[PDB]
Write a protein that binds this DNA or RNA. Structure first.
Ligand SMILES: [Zn+2]
Ligand SMILES: [Zn+2]
Lengths: 186, 853, 73, 186
RNA sequence: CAUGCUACGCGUAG
RNA sequence: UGCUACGCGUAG
RNA sequence: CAUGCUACGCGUAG
RNA sequence: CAUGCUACGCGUAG
């Protein structure tokens, strides 16, 4: 508040009043110094209220524009942020089936429908490469979602019947990968 | 053994279970005088009084009488009782058919009774008929208390009999046989003309055939009634008589008019199932101009929408379908709830949500599919046409009106109307053009007064839109709200706002609407309920499917109680037409769900102006009904206090032996209830402090009595698992408005504080209903309010409950720190930062409960 | 505990599914809502984890909708 | 503020005070002109206050008339929209059957619910399951409300066209129930 | 925005 | 995207 | 003409 | 400065 022009006048009036009361002057001196300090304080509170209202208006404008900016920033970046949070919490959960299906969707082994929880149901999933096949499939046993499934049937890309015996490293180029395999839960 | 008996003499009077030469000569003489009448009596093991007692005083523990009655008359088999929840109406509705097997057996009896009366009318024998004296077949073997008079001038006393039988008629659907040609279950149904809506002659015929000797005048149309006591009496019979008539005849009465040369279709009446035919008095044909008021009246009227829309046949629900206003059906789904990761991580870092902890998340945002909204409407089948005991109802309405004698009511002008929020939906079809502010600013005060005067003489059918609510809940079931049109609100407010504000501004009464729980208010209400009780015991219950399964008679009664304050401003016809408007716009309305119109069978809409207050009046009425049923179910000869015995005698007198209102006994009963049955009612929540000894001896209402009343009135089954009973006042009520009570020490004073469930507060903090509320820096006030609400948790003996408040405080402080950091990063720090300090100090939240302010 | 964060993960999963315009299909959306409501109203961690696996497989069914390789890393 | 009558007197008093202070007169005339200047300044303050007040009420009246003009504009818009919608729904209804059922009634008043039952040419039936489909909308033509309706279109819950042959017992699980069937009167 | 209080300055009257 | 009550918050 | 007290009106700050 | 109002937002309750 020292930057205001009235601050110097108010300080001078206060110092003069203190020096006059400390020296023991007459009562008329007390009255005139009282009047001086009173008008100085009136002007000081005037200027202080003006400056405080100015700063309050500025603060309200700044907080309002900050609110609007945060609102629009949250409205803009919702999809990517929410998906990143989802995958972060998924990795934090650390389950066998969860991590297994995440890796299987990463390398390319994505299903066609919901993995059923019933003891008997059809589960269909694609396999792009023979590497993921031999990693997940073993004869008639399928390791999916940390569970064992009984392999039922296999289809190629052109909807032609293929047996499990024909699926081999020698016959992989002759196969139309990816292969859609449907199986039953054991 | 114990048999039902409706006894009345100078010593004992009441309907309860009892043990069981010149008089015999008089009996034989009366029998010889009435030998030719076929209705005069073999005898069955159970009489009519036994069935009425079993159906009105139903207890899950003792059902031997009802089971034997159902098995003897081939109503159902014994293995049917092995099915779980066979007595419930919500669970396993097939029992509704079982009771129907008795309907005919009841109906066939009624005629016999009339014949019996005729016999007395042919012999000049004045006497009283009782239920315990007529077997379930229909024969009358009673020949006592019959004095001889001039033959041909005898009058029967048929008040108590038909009064107590009223509920069994609607519960068993005894009049179904009236819907067949020549009255025969084997013959086909009656094919009524679709263009016929006036069944007045049919109602008169049914009344003269069933209730012939009912000396009170019955008006098929409620327009010609003397007072509310007559409107209720007429509606009690209209509810029963409307079951026979087809449902297509009811609804608005439409007609073609001419406006400036073009033919318009406007509603010129309404066919209420309880009020009959109501024709508008200000119908002007061949008009040449249409103003704003008439524009709103015709837009809110569903006649044009139903005429323009195409026919609809909905098989998903059982309610009647009107039309489909759109070519494509709309399916509304609920969005998944948001998740605030910051607060969740902050709570987990402090040791919350650990395994085995008593504090866990129980409340989340539950999502729904497309066919869920309408499925909520599919619950409206829980509302059945119910006939109530008319004399008991006319007594309970007065006893309840005595609770509202301290308030004032009347009609206010448009300048005196106060609206809380104007930027809200105005209903259908008013939501297509703007909000409520649009119509509140377009229409001047004179236009609103003109609309009110028009509604005072005519009835306007309206359309109410039911939508899903996005809110936190602990059950997978969804919640729907029925926003009514603005034409209904601007009238209901103008009519009831004075009383609504008088009730909300009154402290220390039974209805605690408007009383805050902060600043020592909860302690004030708790000490008000404890107003001088000898052996105080607290009790609380709930109403399963209250807004859905509540009959229309109780809603009409509540509306009449609310409108009785207009003794000098409104006339008779004005009040009747206001009641008709309330019934057409709330009771029996037109529901626009998924762009399709349906007929609501009944129940209370949740978008009305008189919503909470109607439920409060309903709760008071149910409580008084339970009290009267408990006091009259006692033997009366085992009570050692003469005062209550004489009071029960006078109660029976004013119920079944008197017709005019006895204000003295009403005052006595009100004082007795306030002394031995203190009540705190907020809408559907109720906490009662009753004298334990009087409840033990059956002098006041108890849990089983409320259960029985809800069974034979609200047609719902109240399980004792949801009702709580407290024997120690120091601990306080178990749960009131989802708030528990705890006695703490504040300033050397022992005061009751209300604390909520920590799971609800934590769910509100973690899961929000919008994306901006997650991390928008506006959550500071949200968490401040949550801490204000959950502060009383810090005094709980469970430290896990107390740590929630400290966690909220630390989270608010961390949010303030992040906000200050962000402001410093973008520009500069704020000057009034210190003002935020009070938001992370416990004094600001402790002062909110001090009774100083 | 695992129950709380499993429920939160299921909530976020249903949120992402609704955001991916899965609600256009009535049967799939109804099944997802049923699974989510069963996860919320559950007391056994095993059934909750199985239903979470089912809903995650629902999300993984659409390959072009979400880029697993770039987003997981 | 020059238009105020007291402003001129205050300015004259201030000029006289300055002229007297520049000349250095006796204390008596100085304090007299000080009192006069103070009276003039008080009057100036009062007239300035009432001027600010009249300006404030003028601004309030301007805002009020602007709000009234906005209200009139929105009322005209609402009236136009309501009249348009009313006339549209008026031209939408069928008169051939409405006039018939009205002239058939002796009193002239008819229930509302029978209006769409007997005067509507289109019927939309929502079928939840296959059993209700076989019980009600069996075949290309069905009977309802004593009227024969020929099936015109069938749509699923996802607003997709569904053929009549697709509705079978084996294909019921794959269909998106409920089904909305629109049929014209015949 | 209104009301009231406290403090200050000014003017009128005793 | 209902009615009512209370309670906070920021402005006049 | 100066000092003090009381009542009234106006403006300013809290 | 206190109180009460008006405008907007937010939280809880039935
Ligand atoms: Zn009557
Ligand atoms: Zn009135």
């Amino acid at each position: 508040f020292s930057s205001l022009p009235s601050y110097a006048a108010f300080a001078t009036a206060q110092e003069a009043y203190e020096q006059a009361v400390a020296n023991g002057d007459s009562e008329v001196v007390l009255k005139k110094l009282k009047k001086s300090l009173n008008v100085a304080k009136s002007e000081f509170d005037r200027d202080a209220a003006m400056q405080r209202k100015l700063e309050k208006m500025a603060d309200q404008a700044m907080t309002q524009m900050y609110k609007q900016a945060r609102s629009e920033d949250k409205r803009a970046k919702v999809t990517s942020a929410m998906q990143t949070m989802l995958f972060t919490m998924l990795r934090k959960l650390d389950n066998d089936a969860l991590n297994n299906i995440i890796n299987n969707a990463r390398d390319g082994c994505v299903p066609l429908n919901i993995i059923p929880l019933t003891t008997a149901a059809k589960l269909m999933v694609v396999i792009p490469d023979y590497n993921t096949y031999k990693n997940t499939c073993d004869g008639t046993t399928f390791t999916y979602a940390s569970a064992l499934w009984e392999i039922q049937q296999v289809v190629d890309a052109d909807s032609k019947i293929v047996q499990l015996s024909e699926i081999s490293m020698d016959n992989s180029p002759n196969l139309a990968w990816p292969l859609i395999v449907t199986a039953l839960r054991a | 053994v114990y048999r039902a008996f409706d006894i009345y003499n100078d010593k004992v009077a009441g309907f309860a279970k009892f043990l069981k030469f010149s008089n015999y000569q008089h009996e034989e003489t009366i029998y010889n005088l009435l030998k030719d009448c076929p209705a005069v009596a073999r005898l069955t093991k159970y009489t009519m009084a036994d069935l009425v007692y079993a159906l009105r005083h139903f207890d899950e523990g003792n059902c031997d009488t009802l089971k034997e009655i159902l098995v003897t008359y081939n109503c159902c088999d014994d293995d049917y009782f092995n099915k779980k929840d066979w007595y419930d109406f919500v669970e396993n509705p097939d029992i509704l058919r079982v009771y129907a097997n008795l309907g005919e057996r009841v109906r066939q009896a009624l005629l016999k009774t009339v014949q019996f009366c005729d016999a007395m009318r042919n012999a000049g024998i004045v006497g009283v008929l009782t239920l315990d004296n007529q077997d379930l077949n229909g024969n009358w073997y009673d020949f006592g208390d019959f004095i001889q008079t001039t033959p041909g001038s005898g009058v029967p006393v048929v008040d108590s009999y038909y009064s107590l039988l009223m509920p069994i008629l609607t519960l068993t659907r005894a009049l179904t046989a009236e819907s067949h040609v020549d009255t025969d279950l084997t013959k086909p149904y009656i094919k009524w003309d679709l263009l016929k809506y006036d069944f007045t002659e049919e109602r008169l015929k049914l009344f003269d055939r069933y209730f012939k000797y009912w000396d009170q005048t019955y008006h098929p149309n409620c327009v010609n009634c003397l007072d509310d006591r007559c409107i209720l009496h007429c509606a009690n019979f209209n509810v029963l008589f409307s079951t026979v008539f087809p449902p297509t005849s009811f609804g608005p009465l439409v007609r073609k008019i001419f406006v400036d040369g073009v033919p318009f279709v406007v509603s010129t009446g309404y066919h209420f199932r309880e009020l009959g035919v109501v024709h508008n008095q200000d119908v002007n044909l061949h008009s040449s101009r249409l103003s704003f008021k008439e524009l709103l009246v015709y837009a809110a009227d569903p006649a044009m929408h139903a005429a323009s829309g195409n026919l609809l046949l909905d098989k998903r629900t059982t309610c009647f379908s009107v039309a489909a206003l759109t070519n494509n059906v709309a399916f509304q789904t609920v969005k998944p709830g948001n998740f605030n990761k910051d607060f969740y991580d902050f709570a987990v870092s402090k040791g919350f949500f650990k395994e085995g902890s008593s504090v866990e998340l129980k409340h989340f945002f539950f999502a729904q599919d497309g066919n869920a909204a309408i499925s909520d409407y599919d619950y409206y089948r829980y509302n059945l046409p119910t006939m109530c005991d008319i004399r008991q109802l006319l007594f309970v309405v007065e006893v309840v009106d005595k609770y509202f004698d301290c308030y004032d009511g009347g009609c206010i002008n448009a300048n005196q109307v106060i609206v809380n929020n104007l930027d809200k939906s105005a209903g259908f079809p008013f939501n297509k053009w703007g909000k409520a502010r649009l119509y509140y600013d377009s229409m001047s005060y004179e236009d609103q007064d003109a609309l009110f005067a028009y509604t005072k003489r005519n009835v306007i059918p309206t359309i109410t839109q039911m939508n899903l609510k996005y809110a936190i809940s602990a059950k997978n079931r969804a919640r729907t709200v029925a926003g009514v049109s603005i034409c209904s609100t601007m009238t209901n407010r103008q009519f009831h706002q004075k009383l609504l504000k008088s009730i909300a501004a009154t402290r220390g009464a039974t209805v605690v609407i408007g009383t805050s729980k902060f600043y020592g208010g909860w302690h004030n209400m708790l000490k008000t309920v404890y107003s001088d009780v000898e052996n105080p015991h607290l009790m609380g219950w709930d109403y399963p499917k209250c807004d859905r399964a509540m009959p229309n008679m109780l809603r009409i009664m509540a509306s009449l109680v609310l409108a009785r304050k207009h003794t000098t401003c409104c006339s008779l016809s004005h009040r009747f037409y206001r009641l008709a408007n309330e019934c057409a716009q709330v009771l029996s309305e037109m529901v626009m769900c998924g762009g399709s119109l349906y007929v609501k069978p009944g129940g209370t809409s949740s978008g009305d102006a008189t919503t909470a207050y109607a439920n409060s009046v309903f709760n008071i009425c149910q409580a008084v009904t339970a009290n009267v049923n408990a006091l009259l179910s006692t033997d009366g000869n085992k009570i050692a206090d003469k005062y209550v015995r004489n009071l029960q005698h006078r109660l029976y007198e004013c119920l079944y032996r008197n017709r005019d209102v006895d204000t003295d006994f009403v005052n006595e009963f009100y004082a007795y209830l306030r002394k031995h049955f203190s009540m705190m009612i907020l809408s559907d929540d109720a906490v009662v402090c009753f004298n334990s000894t009087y409840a033990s001896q059956g002098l006041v209402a108890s849990i089983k009595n409320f259960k029985s009343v809800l069974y034979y009135q609200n047609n719902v089954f109240m399980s004792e698992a949801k009702c709580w009973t407290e024997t120690d006042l120091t601990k306080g009520p178990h749960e009131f408005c989802s708030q528990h009570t705890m006695l703490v020490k504040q300033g050397d004073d022992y005061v009751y504080l209300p604390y909520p469930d920590p799971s609800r507060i934590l769910g509100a903090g973690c899961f929000v209903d919008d994306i901006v509320k997650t991390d928008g820096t506006l959550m500071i006030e949200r968490f401040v309010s949550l801490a204000i609400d959950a502060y009383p948790l810090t005094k709980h003996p469970n430290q896990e409950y107390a740590d929630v408040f400290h966690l909220y405080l630390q989270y608010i402080r961390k949010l303030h720190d992040e906000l200050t950091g962000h402001m410093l990063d973008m520009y500069s720090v704020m000057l009034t930062n210190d003002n935020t300090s009070r938001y992370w100090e416990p004094e600001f939240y402790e002062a909110m409960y001090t009774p100083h302010t | 505990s695992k129950m709380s964060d499993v429920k939160c993960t299921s909530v976020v999963l249903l949120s992402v599914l609704q955001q991916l315009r899965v609600e256009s299909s009535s049967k799939l959306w109804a099944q997802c809502v049923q699974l989510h409501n069963d996860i919320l109203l559950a007391k056994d961690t095993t059934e909750a984890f199985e239903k979470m696996v089912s809903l995650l497989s629902v999300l993984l069914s659409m390959q072009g909708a979400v880029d697993i390789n770039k987003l997981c890393e």
